């Protein structure tokens, strides 16, 4: 019984062409609608719970999209870009997805026309590149100007940046925190240095920034409560090496006939720990830290001599600590000297939310701080941190790049107008693409007004008319609910954000449109 031979595996699914192509575009639109509401001064955030039952709220879509495990292929690309732009610049990743599908959306009818995607992407490259340069041209710096303190602009950017996520009512609060905090990050400039302490409870308005490090952590040993917990001007020891009687050291059997030698040996093992401790004590310092466990007894010795100690510490916070106090973490107790020995303005340790924390700050030269984040909801913490995270990295680039632009959709409206007139220059099939490129482009405020529940059409026609001649940074006000100089209303953005945004979107469709069929393997 012969059978006609299959080409590929049973159930190897494929679908080709426009019906294939258009389907993805729909999925993109489906994706966007999951995020359309999100960003905005009156924007939106979502909650998603896993199969494990852990709830998860978020306002930055990339996190949400990461939560939203896509099964479709082409949609993952959209998810992929979010991580890119999130790993690049932060919020507006929200908008970034809006960028793509809307770019997808307007061409989709032109896709119904049997247009070679290469044509479409050809303008897309043309449009983005031409768009990009105009961004650079109308970008705004301040260091040529005179009325900027090096942080005010950073201060303004975050307020702008912060004016979308869950702590929107306290932007004026945290903005100073992060800017002066980020003022410390020089010049490693990396987020790993600065810790975040998701301390439960307390009003987030009482959340703290310490010009030092605190420990959300500890562990109970015997005397760990007994010793003094105030050290007004202490000296800080950082040990990586553990402190215990040969708990986990080199493995060796020993052989001894004589009891006294047996006697002598066990005594000697102790003298080992004492000898380090003597080195520990005779250092004259008062605080010792260890990633490793510490013998309980030494604590008593430290308690007996009223020195503080702590073991099993996170090295990261220890890494902060050494980067905070300038002292050097040690593995050799004997080669110790005061040069590697940390000093701090004052050390303490305080109860916060019942939790047992360890306090030390005031180091004049400490390029690393930590964020004590009070808050009564578990979900708030990571959400805030994600908000906190974005705030830091975005201003970090701002520190890197003294280029700013107004927000409130003004930029895009300016672009759409510029390209709109430019489309008149270029005849033919490209011209239609340019307008739609502009026609997709304007969407961002429209959703904002949608998320404001306003009549964006009046706003848009007003805007387009008002953006015809009278001023560049005229843009939407949420509160006055119409056009405003959001720049003078101080809605200020780093160019790179939208710069990378549109470019990443540009390739996305250029990636997106460039496929004719799908193939599936079980």
């Amino acid at each position: 019984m012969p059978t006609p031979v299959i080409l590929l595996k049973e159930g190897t699914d494929s679908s080709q062409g426009i019906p294939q192509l258009v389907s993805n575009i729909s999925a993109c639109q489906v994706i966007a609608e999951a995020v359309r509401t999100t960003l905005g001064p009156r924007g939106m955030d979502k909650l998603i719970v896993d199969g494990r039952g852990k709830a998860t709220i978020s306002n930055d879509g990339a996190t949400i999209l990461k939560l939203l495990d896509v099964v479709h292929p082409a949609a993952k690309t959209l998810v992929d870009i979010a991580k890119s732009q999130d790993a690049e610049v932060g919020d507006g990743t929200t908008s970034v997805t809006l960028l793509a599908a809307e770019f997808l959306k307007q061409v989709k009818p032109y896709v119904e026309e049997g247009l070679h995607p290469q044509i479409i992407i050809r303008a897309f490259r043309t449009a983005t590149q031409l768009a990009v340069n105009k961004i650079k041209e109308i970008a705004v710096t301040v260091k040529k100007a005179d009325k900027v303190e090096q942080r005010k602009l950073l201060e303004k950017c975050a307020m702008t940046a912060l004016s979308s996520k869950l702590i929107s009512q306290q932007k004026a609060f945290f903005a100073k925190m992060v800017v002066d905090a980020v003022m410390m990050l020089d010049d490693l400039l990396q987020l790993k240095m600065i810790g975040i302490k998701k301390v439960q409870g307390g009003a987030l308005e009482d959340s703290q920034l310490v010009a030092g490090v605190a420990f959300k952590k500890t562990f109970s040993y015997a005397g760990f409560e007994m010793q003094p917990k105030k050290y007004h001007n202490p000296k800080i020891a950082l040990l990586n090496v553990e402190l215990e009687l040969k708990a986990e050291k080199d493995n060796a059997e020993i052989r001894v006939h004589t009891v006294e030698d047996y006697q002598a040996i066990v005594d000697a093992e102790w003298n080992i720990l004492y000898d380090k401790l003597e080195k520990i004590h005779h250092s004259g310092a008062k605080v010792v830290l260890s990633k490793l466990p510490i013998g309980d007894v030494a604590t008593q010795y430290f308690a007996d001599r009223d020195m503080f100690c702590a073991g099993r510490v996170p090295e990261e916070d220890l890494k902060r600590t050494m980067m905070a106090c300038g002292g050097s973490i040690q593995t050799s107790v004997n080669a110790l000297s005061a040069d590697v020995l940390g000093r701090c303005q004052v050390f303490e340790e305080t109860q916060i939310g019942g939790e047992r924390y360890n306090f030390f700050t005031g180091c004049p030269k400490a390029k690393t701080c930590t964020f004590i984040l009070r808050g009564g909801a578990e979900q708030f913490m990571e959400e805030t941190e994600r908000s906190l995270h974005d705030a830091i990295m975005i201003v970090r680039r701002a520190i890197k790049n003294d280029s700013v632009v107004a927000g409130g959709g003004a930029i895009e409206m300016e672009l759409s107008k510029y390209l709109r007139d430019y489309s008149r220059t270029i005849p033919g099939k490209q011209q239609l693409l340019i307008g739609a490129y502009a026609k997709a482009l304007e969407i961002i405020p429209r959703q904002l007004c949608d998320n404001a529940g306003f009549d964006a059409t009046n706003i848009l026609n007003k805007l387009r008319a008002r953006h015809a001649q009278g001023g560049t940074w005229y843009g939407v006000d949420i509160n006055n609910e119409d056009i405003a100089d959001n720049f003078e209303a101080f809605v200020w953005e780093p160019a790179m954000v939208r710069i990378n945004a549109l470019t990443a979107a540009s390739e996305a469709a250029c990636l997106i449109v460039s496929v004719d069929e799908t193939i599936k393997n079980p």
């Binding site: 019906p19 247009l115 033919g428 099939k429 239609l432 949608d450």
Partner: protein, 532 residues
Amino acid sequence: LSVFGDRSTGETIRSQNVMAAASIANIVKSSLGPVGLDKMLVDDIGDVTITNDGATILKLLEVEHPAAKVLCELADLQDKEVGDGTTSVVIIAAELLKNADELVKQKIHPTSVISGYRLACKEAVRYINENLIVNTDELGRDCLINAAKTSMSSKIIGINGDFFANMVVDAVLAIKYTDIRGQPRYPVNSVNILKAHGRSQMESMLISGYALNCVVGSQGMPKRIVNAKIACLDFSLQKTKMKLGVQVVITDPEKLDQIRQRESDITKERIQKILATGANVILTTGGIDDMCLKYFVEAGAMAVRRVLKRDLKRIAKASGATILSTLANLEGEETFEAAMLGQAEEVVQERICDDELILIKNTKARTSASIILRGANDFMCDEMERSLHDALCVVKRVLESKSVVPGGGAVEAALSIYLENYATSMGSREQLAIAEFARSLLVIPNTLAVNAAQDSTDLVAKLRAFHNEAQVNPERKNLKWIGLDLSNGKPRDNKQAGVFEPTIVKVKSLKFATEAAITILRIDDLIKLHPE
């Protein structure tokens, strides 16, 4: 909170129906215009059906979602009102729905959208009458030739149309009929069409009369009658009944033979009474007994049993016969009159595709037209008649309305821009809907071009330009034009090309489309209910 099914509201259902409609559109998007490609469906068991007309396709398409069924039934109605535009009208429905939805998909108030659409249709048809072209001045036969072959395009038979349309136009002028005493109404579906696989449509023949999908009852009975002696009789011929309950009781056996005798003699004498008139052709939808068969052979007569009711009605109207449900008289005796006879030149049963079907030639009382179909398979004939079925209607409408519209999509080409300017008149927000109305209305040439598979926009753009030009320099007698082509992929004058369509087609099309989207657009929520 209702059991056995939930609900979804707003955009979710809103877009959902849009997704439903667009799905419907793409099903038929390839079978329209002179380059549309016809569809076929395996039923479930191989009794497949190839056809280009969506109204068939939709009617043969099972639907479960509501809104789509609206379109299918709507597709049916326009078919019941036009017959084609099935090529187009549903395509119009979803696309206008597509764009209108998109506006609301942002914020736009639906009722506002409805209102502009209301105006848009009224605006359109008024200008339609302001752009009309009349066929009265034109050569009657010529334009009917033109529109038919225009209608013959997109169909299986479009190559042979000239033969076909010529065949068709003769049929309708042969189906002339005097109406309410003031109209010459021309009855469609009155023409008889018989499908028969075999020879080519090259050999397909029109009957200057009627043709019967029937045979001679009696093999011994003669076959062809050169005379006009023709009757129809609804009254069946069997041994006459008691026909309600009337019992026959015998206490005196001596007359049962006489009883049983007359049982058939009644039928016999009825045979004799009608035969004595000398009638040579008879039909009876009722059953015909062999006793009658024998008698007619003795007459060498001609008779038919089980003829479909409508055709013999056409026969009586054709031959001038009186269909007779029975024999009677204003006096009680059942009598029969020669004046009841129908008359025609010659009647033959002829074996086409080895099957003898009966032909009627030239009834003198009322001229008749019927058409014999020849083709390869049964699949080909039953579809081509539908095109033929639609073929009649359009010409009938042209006869019905002595006025023409040029074919080949000029309509929206003119409409789009004229509305585009007209949109600016209102100053409201509805002109956007007007603009999308026009924008969505632009779909047809795009469908044409994709169905012709070339660069559509540029064709559209050129079509936009000349029509836009047709709205510049009001000296348009030498600036107003109309036309577009696809085979050569460039615009033309369909008026010169003869590419014409009936006005009523697009008229009801837009209106029926207008109503449909209105119905669909106002929806905002669906609720499911599981069965018992």
